[PDB]
Design a protein around this ligand. Structure first.
Ligand SMILES: [Ca+2]
Length: 151
């Protein structure tokens, strides 16, 4: 359904924390317009202790309330990946023309307030404070894998 690239800006600490932050910029690198409602991203990790989780988007270029989050299990589990968060967009989020990008700042946490070990997560990188192309967050358009490497 088109072409995209995912850039990730890691502002997390290595220390165990109750929150994992995700700052993501997705650029339309193809020749076709993209409706953001068709775009899903997945960030894969080990949950570390079992708890209900909550997703929040604090800011997006298309409006924080137009960003959705949900969770899934990786089964059978893989190295660094027993869980993922899937970030999506509402019907009202709009289009990206070729060359345009969407940016969002989001996070997730465990509602029992237990901590994550981030360092072992499949999608966690080691490049801090700089947006880089990051192939361990996958992107799908209309269900079709367009960017990245599934665990
Ligand atoms: Ca973990």
């Amino acid at each position: 359904m088109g072409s995209v690239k995912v850039r990730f800006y890691n502002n997390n600490t290595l220390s165990e924390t109750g929150v994992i932050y995700m700052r993501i910029n997705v650029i339309n690198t193809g020749n076709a317009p993209l409706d953001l409602s068709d775009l899903k991203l997945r960030y894969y990790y080990t949950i570390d202790s079992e708890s209900e989780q909550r997703f929040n988007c604090d800011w997006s270029s298309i409006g924080a309330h137009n960003v959705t989050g949900s969770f899934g299990k990786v089964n059978p589990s893989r190295n660094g990946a027993d869980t993922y968060v899937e970030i999506g967009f509402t019907k009202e989020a709009g289009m990206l023309q070729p060359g345009e990008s969407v940016e969002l700042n989001a996070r997730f946490s465990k509602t029992d307030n237990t901590q994550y070990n981030k360092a072992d997560d499949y999608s966690f990188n080691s490049h801090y404070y700089e947006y880089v192309d990051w192939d361990r967050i996958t992107a799908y358009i209309s269900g079709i894998l367009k960017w990245g490497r599934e665990p």
